[PDB]
Design a protein around this ligand. Structure first.
Ligand SMILES: *[C@@H]1O[C@H](CO)[C@@H](O[C@@H]2O[C@H](CO)[C@@H](O[C@@H]3O[C@H](CO)[C@@H](O)[C@H](O[C@H]4O[C@H](CO)[C@@H](O)[C@H](O)[C@@H]4O)[C@@H]3O)[C@H](O)[C@H]2NC(C)=O)[C@H](O)[C@H]1NC(C)=O
Lengths: 114, 49
């Protein structure tokens, strides 16, 4: 069965970084696009970062650019988010996202499933 | 018409079978169960270059 499990979150101090991990099960990892979304209380939803199967295309939002880094490894079957210089805006509920068309965007078929 | 004539003498004759019986056709075979994995190659998300 398809599940995505997020771990590594917690409380941090300014100037301190942390490590997020996204471990998932039930589907083959080597052909799917994965993305990060955070949910802060009562301000809707906003995108963080993403990755594809080849990881050649990596994108960040300009508000969060320059201090995040997304990484992924097939052997350990998990998605990794690297934080640097954590600030006040970072306080949100972080979601881990899988796509259905192995790529970021642009195609006729794309969508967030699990 | 099995003696090939129109007059027959007294006695008992051993004729042949000229009545025609219609027939049908039938065929049976075992249970098709072990299909080939065509979906994996024809319905894959990504194709190699
Ligand atoms: C690749 O994947 C696609 C999509 O997953 C697949 O095409 C689909 O094939 C199924 C095969 O069953 C199609 O399902 C049929 O749909 C028609 C209407 O379009 C229905 O009338 C059919 O109903 C019969 O079968 C049912 C059992 O499934 C019975 O309960 C019923 O009484 C009928 O006898 C059936 O549901 C489906 O429509 C297509 N979809 C598309 C978009 O084409 C394709 O076959 C896959 N390719 C390979 C090579 O496997």
């Amino acid at each position: 069965e398809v599940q995505l499990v997020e771990s590594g979150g917690g409380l941090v101090q300014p100037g301190r970084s942390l490590r997020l991990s996204c471990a998932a099960s039930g589907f083959r990892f080597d052909d799917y696009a994965l993305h990060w979304v955070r949910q802060a209380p009562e301000k809707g939803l906003e995108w963080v970062s993403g990755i594809s199967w080849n990881s050649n295309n990596i994108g960040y939002a300009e508000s969060v650019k320059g201090r995040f880094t997304i990484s992924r490894d097939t052997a350990k079957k998990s998605l990794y988010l690297q934080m640097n210089d954590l600030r006040a805006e970072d306080t949100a509920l972080y979601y881990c996202v899988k796509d259905r068309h192995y790529d970021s965007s642009g195609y006729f078929v794309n969508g967030f499933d699990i | 018409c099995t003696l090939k004539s129109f007059t027959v003498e007294k006695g008992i004759y051993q004729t042949s079978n000229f009545r025609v019986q219609p027939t049908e056709s039938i065929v049976r075979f075992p249970n098709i169960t072990n299909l080939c994995p065509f979906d994996e190659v024809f319905n894959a998300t990504r194709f190699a270059s």
